[PDB]
Write a protein that binds this ligand. Structure first.
Ligand SMILES: OC[C@H]1O[C@@](CO)(O[C@H]2O[C@H](CO)[C@@H](O)[C@H](O)[C@H]2O)[C@@H](O)[C@@H]1O
Lengths: 141, 141
């Protein structure tokens, strides 16, 4: 894109939501050094060019964006949130929470496939889409 | 007014979310004839005027438009959703779902006190707030 932008404040996330027009805004909430975020971030970086017409991808430091981290109840990282023209786009990936996509992707193409689904739903005026793919597994207690 | 505005299509809801500036937008998803909706609509109507500096209230017909009902995962009516400057507000009532209030308020004052807290927090940039309502007064269902 080439590079992935980093956001480190509530105000920067607000500005990305407000200024990103006609593309899916992808907000990866995480920590750059977290191993699962490192895995996702590599997919994001690699796929970003092929998705540049459909999506603008930003990395967000979960620890520095309290208003958003608390609002989305980010409890496991990475957690990725989607917006389109200032509307929060929800994604049903079979789990009860449609608000954020928790975990990394199996493959780069799975991520592209999700993004296409979001984009084409949002262009049609949809606000919630079903994901054609399932997330990679996040182990819990 | 006493007779709160009705929204009967997705585009009308989209527009109220965009057009309500600097006040809490209150969206009541329900049916005007339903008994619990009648209880809640009486409180919304009777408090609307003295809340008019802090909130704009709308009645959303779930039998004429349904896009938003799926978007907010609404299974039971009434369900009431809060927004501020285009972005959804969460409220922790003491139950797991912070995205919407389900059922009717026990008293006028509970709704007033809630709007006060939502408005002040939203004006300070918050997106999630703590409900002030005593849990004994929160419908359980
Ligand atoms: O993930 C648990 C952690 O989240 C907080 C909010 O930061 O509260 C959430 O989880 C509580 C326990 O499940 C819920 O009862 C509450 O509704 C929810 O917001 C913390 O208080 C909690 O330690």
């Amino acid at each position: 894109s080439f590079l992935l932008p980093k956001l480190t404040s509530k105000k920067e996330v607000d500005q990305a939501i407000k200024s990103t027009a006609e593309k899916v805004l992808v907000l990866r909430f995480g920590r750059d050094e977290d191993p699962v975020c490192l895995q996702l971030d590599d997919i994001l970086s690699k796929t970003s060019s092929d998705l540049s017409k459909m999506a603008a991808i930003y990395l967000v430091d979960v620890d520095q964006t309290a208003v958003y981290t608390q609002y989305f109840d980010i409890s496991y990282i990475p957690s990725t949130v989607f917006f389109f023209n200032g509307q929060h786009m929800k994604v049903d990936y079979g789990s009860p929470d449609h608000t954020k996509f928790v975990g990394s992707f199996k493959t780069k193409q799975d991520f592209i496939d999700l993004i296409e689904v979001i984009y084409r739903g949002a262009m049609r005026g949809k606000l919630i889409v079903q994901s054609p793919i399932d997330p990679k597994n996040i182990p819990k207690y």
